[PDB]
Design a protein around this nucleic acid. Structure first.
Ligand SMILES: [Mg+2]
Ligand SMILES: [Zn+2]
Ligand SMILES: [Zn+2]
Ligand SMILES: [Zn+2]
Ligand SMILES: [Zn+2]
Ligand SMILES: [Zn+2]
Ligand SMILES: [Zn+2]
Lengths: 188, 111, 48, 84, 299, 56, 130, 138
RNA sequence: CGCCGCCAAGGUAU
RNA sequence: UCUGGUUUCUCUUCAGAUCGCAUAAAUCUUUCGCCUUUUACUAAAGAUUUCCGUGGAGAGGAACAACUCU
């Protein structure tokens, strides 16, 4: 249902290398919100970093000026809830599956086939910015987003690979502080 | 040959070391089947020989007359002694087409 | 005619694509300027 | 300016020693392997009652469409009784 | 006005000016040859398509009717400047064609050189090589004298070689470079041949029936080569008064053929410069580079 | 049985139309270029038991 | 075509009503993208150079119009004097000696390229987490 | 065992028979075990490794040592104790410490390149113990 | 002068 | 004295030759025979394809390519 040529890709997910190689597919994975068949792309950002293939589709990224794989804004590098709390206009979108979700999603994809350059509703209110959201606008961000997720068998001490296990090691996670609108625990 | 609820004999540890017993393997005598004696029982008859066969994709062949006469002698008991197309009178394809079109038949022929 | 011909050729190579089509020859690069954030983001990222 | 005058030549004839040397004007270069590979793969998979290989079993159903293309080429090459 | 041109998606390796000064030709890594109006609004018209490798070198014949194109795909194409239709493919070399030149005056001839170490003489009417000169090291740059008797070849042995078309012998060798020669070009008189080399030396060599026998006529400096290992080409001005050669340090160097003073150092390019050309009538310099843009400097 | 094989041979020889196919393909060479298909030389009974195992 | 036509700037106050991101040129909502035909070998060579030692040259066309510098980790470029990954270096430092057994005759002793090297309180917290 | 050549092969086969028989027994032991503990492909590594050491044993038996004859060398290639195309790759100049044939297939890799196993370690980065997922180690 | 060789949906509701 | 090449593996379109010294199925439009409705059907013609293979041609290698046709 969806073909693409190149995704949004904010700078913190591209990696530290301007020279990356990337493979593409024609019909890859489903989106974790609306299950639309986008084109998943796969690349290697760094030598100690995971692949971070693709999270969402192009259309849902074109609604709210969101990047492709970590679900942050392209214009700052912030989540969506901070952006529409700072601008006080939410640009509502449903929650269910077949009630009103894919209906207005297909219609907003249909009316946006001409431009493909700017979002549908944020074009008029992304201009009166840089007052309350410029105070937390991180330049040169931490690359810990790009490091791979935690592996098992080091928590239990069974990992036969030792050092050649590519994911991570000696990182005890904490079960006290970890979707599209709400609610996000560390953002509060 | 084998019952239900039984896996298909698991060819890794059953007959990997077991040799086959014997094929048909008709004993060819020398001085009558001497050109064909070395290769008549071989899955590739002539493959690594540029004199008789084309190559490994096994496309074109050239034989000689005693070697083919031994083949013609070994190819009896299923080959006719008919030489010309005179035994096929009213057994030809066109005569059978006529019999198909004319609502009739040859005794011993199709209907 | 060439518009509907390339449309119906994409349709036949999409509805019935089963019989022996090559994929592509992907020897092309793409050059996209990071014209959104970069002043110190990945220092030296100018056209990438 | 003192050793760079030959170091740039070292870089130049090191890059041009692999620029066009490997015939840039391997395409048909896959061949046979040991036959104990398929046996090890299928003795690992088996009757597919495990949770480890669950990403592959749907691919087995993807092998449903082309099965007579294998059975036909199987029965075309049956061993004759003069063979072993 | 300066005039900034753009279009080439990949690195531009060469550009030339039509013999009558009415149009430009440019090509590079993309595989496309673009034609441009020298005057007017500097418009772009035909795109020549059909090369599978990158375009290493463009040339016009003296009539401005034939455009030659050496490619990395081992083929040298002959193009009609008037219609943009392809005329011939010179299929021959076993490796990349590094460069080609077309003989002016005498009946049509073409010379090529490649990584297979050979130099070949082509007659556009035969569809086959006429002569082959096996060197042993990769050949980078080749040019004919105006008498169409000699072939001048620069390779990676730091030694420019001169070949006799009748004897088929190594007539001359020139010593004086410390490193690979990347670009050769004859004066419009046939009198002098201009060379670029990795050693960052621009050297003029004089070729004559009576030669000093130690023909390091002049040396110029300032032109830098680096790790990019780009072929570097140099050109003579229409009257032989100016010498231009591109460099890898983003500057266009133009020298005084006599005093050897740098007349111009020009910036504007972001990357390495691959070729500099002079307009045949007016003091206009076309600078082509790896930043995929062209400039029309006016002096 | 004689006359019914005569019948079938005449029905095969009568509808002997020329092979008017324009293009030709193989479907094995297209599989082999893919990284997921590999060529090896095995025994016969291993191939037969393998395809019946995969069919089950 | 004329260089003066594209070189002529736009008369205006740059229109600061938009932000720095939205007023920037683009064609996709994220950057101006266009395909090209760069060579593969030097591309992958400088890619491996930045992957190993962290320095490479800077590719563009119209950022500053003069650019021949190195990017990434700066000091390691002049420390190694600009070498590549395909070039034999000036020294052989910190080299790591393995052992070999390539007779292919012994049983459970053949260790060629598949050889292991010569060198070969958190549990309480991980129990309290789970 | 299966010989499939009816040859009664000449000298010297009696001195390589218990060695290659022990290698065949260890290859059966590397084929037999289940895949518990071994993740997806590292149970498939040692059969590649033992075919590599068997082909290397015949390789330095005939080419290096020059003891065995050419007829029995071609016999061991034709039966299955050695390869025909792999020794032609070992014949080439730049490499004879090769792993197996899965690093040379440039279209086995979707990125159109060779593996990291066929990379010199002195030009690679300093400490990484990387292993091929197709072939096993380097 | 010697046809012919049979499965299922149709019913024990959703 | 000069001239100097058979196999194997990959794309490249044309096929009008028993393309294959033999011969499968499906679709449509009609005639039938079993038939209750249908898919499974029967068996003849007309015309299309699908499919297992094949013929000659442009290149890139490798396999004794240097034995030697010329
Ligand atoms: Mg009904
Ligand atoms: Zn979506
Ligand atoms: Zn992101
Ligand atoms: Zn681990
Ligand atoms: Zn290897
Ligand atoms: Zn291996
Ligand atoms: Zn590997």
């Amino acid at each position: 249902w969806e073909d693409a040529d190149f995704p949004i890709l904010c700078q913190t997910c591209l990696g530290e290398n301007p020279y990356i190689r990337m493979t593409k597919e024609k019909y890859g994975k489903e989106c974790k919100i609306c299950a639309r068949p986008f084109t998943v792309f796969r690349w290697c950002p760094g030598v100690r970093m995971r692949f971070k293939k693709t999270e969402v589709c192009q259309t849902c990224s074109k609604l709210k000026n969101v990047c492709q794989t970590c679900l942050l804004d392209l214009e700052y590098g912030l989540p969506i809830q901070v952006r529409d709390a700072g601008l006080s206009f939410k640009d509502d979108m449903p929650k269910s599956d077949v009630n009103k979700e894919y209906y207005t999603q297909n219609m907003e994809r249909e009316i946006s086939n001409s431009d493909g350059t700017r979002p549908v509703g944020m074009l008029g209110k992304a201009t009166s910015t840089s007052d309350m959201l410029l105070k937390l606008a991180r330049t040169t961000p931490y690359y810990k987003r790009n490091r791979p997720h935690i592996c098992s068998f080091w928590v239990k001490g069974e990992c036969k690979r030792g050092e050649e296990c590519p994911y991570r090691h000696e990182k005890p996670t904490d079960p006290d502080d970890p979707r599209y609108y709400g609610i996000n625990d560390p953002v509060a | 040959p084998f019952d239900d609820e039984e896996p298909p004999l698991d060819y890794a540890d059953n007959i990997l070391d077991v040799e086959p017993l014997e094929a048909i393997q008709l004993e060819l005598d020398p001085e009558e089947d001497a050109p064909v004696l070395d290769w008549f029982y071989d899955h590739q008859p002539l493959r690594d020989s540029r004199k008789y066969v084309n190559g490994s994709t096994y496309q074109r062949w050239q034989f000689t007359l005693p070697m083919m006469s031994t083949l013609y002698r070994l190819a009896n008991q299923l080959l006719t002694d008919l030489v010309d197309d005179n035994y096929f009178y009213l057994f030809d394809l066109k005569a059978f087409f006529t019999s198909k079109a004319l609502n009739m038949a040859i005794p011993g022929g199709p209907k | 005619r060439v518009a509907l011909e390339k449309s119906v050729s994409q349709k036949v190579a999409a509805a019935m694509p089963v019989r022996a089509a090559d994929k592509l020859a992907p020897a092309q690069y793409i050059r996209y300027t990071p014209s959104q954030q970069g002043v110190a983001f990945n220092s030296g990222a100018k056209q990438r | 300016s003192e050793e760079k005058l030959q170091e740039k030549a070292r870089k130049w004839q090191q890059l041009q020693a692999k620029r066009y040397a490997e015939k840039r004007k391997v395409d048909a270069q896959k061949e046979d392997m040991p036959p104990e590979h398929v046996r090890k793969i299928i003795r690992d998979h088996g009757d597919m009652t495990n949770r480890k290989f669950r990403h592959d079993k749907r691919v087995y159903l993807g092998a449903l469409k082309y099965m007579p293309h294998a059975v036909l080429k199987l029965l075309e090459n049956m061993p004759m009784p003069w063979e072993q | 006005p300066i005039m900034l041109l753009s279009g080439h998606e990949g690195e531009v390796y060469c550009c030339k000016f039509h013999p009558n000064g009415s149009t430009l030709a440019s090509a590079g890594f993309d595989r496309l040859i673009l034609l441009w109006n020298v005057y007017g609004d500097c418009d772009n018209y035909a795109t020549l398509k059909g090369h599978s490798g990158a375009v290493m070198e463009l040339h016009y014949n003296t009539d401005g009717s034939m455009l030659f194109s050496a490619s990395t795909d081992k083929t040298v194409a002959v193009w009609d400047s008037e219609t943009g239709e392809r005329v011939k493919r010179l299929k021959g070399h076993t490796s990349f064609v590094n460069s080609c030149y077309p003989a002016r005056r005498g009946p049509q001839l073409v010379c090529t050189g490649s990584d297979d170490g050979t130099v070949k003489l082509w007659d556009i009417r035969k569809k086959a090589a006429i002569q082959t000169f096996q060197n042993t090291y990769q050949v980078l740059a080749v040019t004919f004298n105006d008498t169409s008797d000699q072939i001048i070849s620069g390779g990676i042995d730091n030694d420019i070689k001169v070949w006799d078309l009748r004897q088929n012998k190594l007539t001359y060798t020139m010593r004086g470079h410390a490193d690979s020669v990347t670009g050769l070009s004859l004066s419009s008189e046939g009198s002098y041949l201009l060379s670029n080399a990795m050693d960052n030396t621009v050297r003029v060599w004089d070729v004559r029936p009576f030669a000093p026998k130690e023909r390091c006529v002049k040396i110029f400096q300032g032109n830098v080569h680096n790790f990019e290992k780009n072929l570097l080409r140099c050109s003579w001005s229409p009257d032989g008064s100016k010498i231009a050669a591109g460099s890898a340090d983003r500057f266009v160097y133009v020298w005084d053929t006599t005093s050897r003073r740098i007349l111009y150092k020009l910036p504007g390019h972001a990357g390495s410069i691959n070729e500099v050309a002079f307009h045949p009538d007016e003091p206009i310099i076309i600078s082509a580079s790896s930043d995929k843009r062209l400039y029309m400097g006016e002096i | 049985s004689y006359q019914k094989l005569l019948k079938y041979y005449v029905l095969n020889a009568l509808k002997h139309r020329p092979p008017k196919a324009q293009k030709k393909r193989y479907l094995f060479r297209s599989f082999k270029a893919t990284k997921f298909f590999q060529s090896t030389k095995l025994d016969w009974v291993e191939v037969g038991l393998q395809v019946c195992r995969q069919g089950y | 075509p004329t260089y003066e036509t594209m070189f002529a700037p736009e008369f205006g106050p740059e229109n600061p009503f938009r932000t720095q991101q939205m007023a920037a040129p683009r064609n996709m909502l994220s950057g101006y993208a266009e395909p090209a035909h760069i060579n593969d070998f030097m591309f992958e060579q400088q890619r491996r150079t930045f992957a190993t030692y962290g320095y490479a040259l800077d590719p563009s066309l119209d950022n500053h119009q003069v650019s021949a510098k190195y990017i990434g980790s700066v000091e390691e470029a002049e420390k190694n004097q600009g070498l590549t990954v395909f070039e034999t270096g000036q020294k052989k430092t910190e080299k790591r000696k393995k052992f070999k057994e390539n007779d292919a005759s012994n049983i459970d002793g053949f260790l060629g390229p598949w050889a292991k090297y010569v060198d070969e309180e958190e549990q309480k917290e991980l129990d309290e987490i789970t | 065992k299966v010989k499939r050549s009816r040859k009664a092969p000449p000298d010297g086969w009696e001195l390589i028979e218990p060695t290659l028989d022990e290698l065949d027994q260890k290859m059966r032991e590397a084929e037999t075990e289940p895949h518990e503990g071994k993740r997806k492909v590292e149970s498939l590594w040692p059969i590649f490794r033992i075919h590599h050491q068997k082909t290397r044993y015949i390789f330095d038996l005939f080419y290096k040592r020059k003891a065995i004859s050419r007829e029995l060398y071609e016999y061991c290639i034709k039966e299955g104790y050695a390869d025909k195309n792999l020794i032609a790759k070992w014949k080439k100049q730049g490499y004879e410490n090769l792993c197996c044939l899965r690093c040379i297939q440039t279209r086995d890799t979707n990125f159109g390149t060779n593996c990291i196993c066929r990379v010199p370690k002195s030009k690679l980065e300093v400490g990484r113990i990387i292993e091929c997922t197709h072939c096993g180690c380097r």
